[PDB]
From a paper:
The Papain-like protease (PLpro) is a domain of a multi-functional, non-structural protein 3 of coronaviruses. PLpro cleaves viral polyproteins and posttranslational conjugates with poly-ubiquitin and protective ISG15, composed of two ubiquitin-like (UBL) domains. PolyUb and ISG15 have common other structural features: ISG15 comprises two Ub-like (UBL) domains and mimics a head-to-tail linked di-ubiquitin (Ub2).
We have also determined the structure of the PLproCoV-2-C111S, D286N double-mutant:K48-Ub2 complex. In total, 41 of 76 distal-Ub residues were built using this electron density map. We additionally interpreted the interface energetics for models of PLproCoV-2 in complex with Ub2 using two geometries of the distal Ub derived from the PLproCoV-1:Ub2 structure and our PLproCoV-2-C111S,D286N:Ub2 structure with a partial distal Ub. Our calculations of interface energetics also indicated that PLproCoV-2-F69A should have a larger effect on interactions with hISG15 compared to Ub2, including the orientation observed in the distal Ub from the partial model of our structure. Our structures revealed how the protease differentially recognizes hISG15 using both UBL domains, while K48-Ub2 is predominantly recognized using the proximal Ub.
Numbering used by the authors:
A (entry chain C): 1 to 2, 7 to 11, 17 to 19, 23 to 29, 35 to 50, 66 to 73
B (entry chain B): 1 to 76
C (entry chain A): 4 to 315
Write the structure that this text describes.
Amino acid sequence: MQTLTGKVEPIENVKAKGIPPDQQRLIFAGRQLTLHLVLRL
Amino acid sequence: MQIFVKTLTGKTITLEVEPSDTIENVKAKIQDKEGIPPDQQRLIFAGKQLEDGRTLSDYNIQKESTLHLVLRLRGG
Amino acid sequence: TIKVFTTVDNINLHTQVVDMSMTYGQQFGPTYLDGADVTKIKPHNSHEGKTFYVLPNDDTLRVEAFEYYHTTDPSFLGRYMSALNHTKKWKYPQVNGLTSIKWADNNSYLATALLTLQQIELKFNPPALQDAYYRARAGEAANFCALILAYCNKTVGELGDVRETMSYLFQHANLDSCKRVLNVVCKTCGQQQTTLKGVEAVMYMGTLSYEQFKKGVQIPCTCGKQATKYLVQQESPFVMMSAPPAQYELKHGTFTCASEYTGNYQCGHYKHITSKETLYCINGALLTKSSEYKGPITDVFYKENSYTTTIK
Ligand SMILES: [Zn+2]
């Protein structure tokens, strides 16, 4: 079943799926868990 | 470990720190030495602004490193 | 009952039927009309057809809010609206082609940032900032200024720092492709190269001079000796060079614009210096033209595209 600049089966696992999970924040329904990827650097 | 902090007057401060210390933790140690409120403090490593919520490890700061303490401006 | 529109972004409007015997708060949660908090207010006849901002209280409004503003901060809307009630009353004079702000409410740092933003190439990521910027460039800058205060966690009347303001706004800009390569050379230890990306690639604290950064600055090496640090490669549309405020000569044609800070670490005032056909000093609504400029400078902005050193 199918970033802020514009760039699975039913969060840690989607993060798992080069950028380590720890730098990834995922946003769905305007809430942190179309999903939104926010990056911490 | 120990790091050096250079102030605007040219005074050098010596701190005892760990790689896992957040920038917030290093600002607390400067307030112990110098009494400067953390909210005024801006720490710089070789020109790079160090940010709250990051660690000295995040910036690869090692023993005997020199930081520069500058102060926030207050423009109206 | 009357019909009204609720919104988080003032782009996507949601038709609502409101019970005129209950406050906006009871029906919508926190509610604002043109910046005014009407949460504790009952609907008025003249509210028919009007647009109200609401704090997101369902999945639609939460997605719309995040897509527009790029924050989940539940205080953001309240802080933005509180700021907008003040910034709507400021004056935004055109000063030789740039939108400035007449001095009010300790706003000189905000006016300096606004002037700088119109002179450097920056793409904002949040639609909120893209949309408000375009209005601000046209002279309608109240929303943009209120957003800058909200994003930077600043209150109207709070003293502020241009460097800090630009840094927070750069976190919301597309600087992904900006890159800086530095080398530090110790005659004992050898050479260490560092690469910085994004916001860290466009900021420097310790010299105002882009040319000095290219030529080399002396820094301590942890071996106990002095090393030389120099810029190897810069790929960005601009750089911001800062230093603790100090007397500095700005030479026509050698920089884009600059922040002058007069005063002390308790209280100061910003002016904006820009290099056009001659030097301009913008002080809110006031403009002075001069062939030379010396003053206490703390930020200098330079244009860039791609720079590579000739140092081997
Ligand atoms: Zn060395």
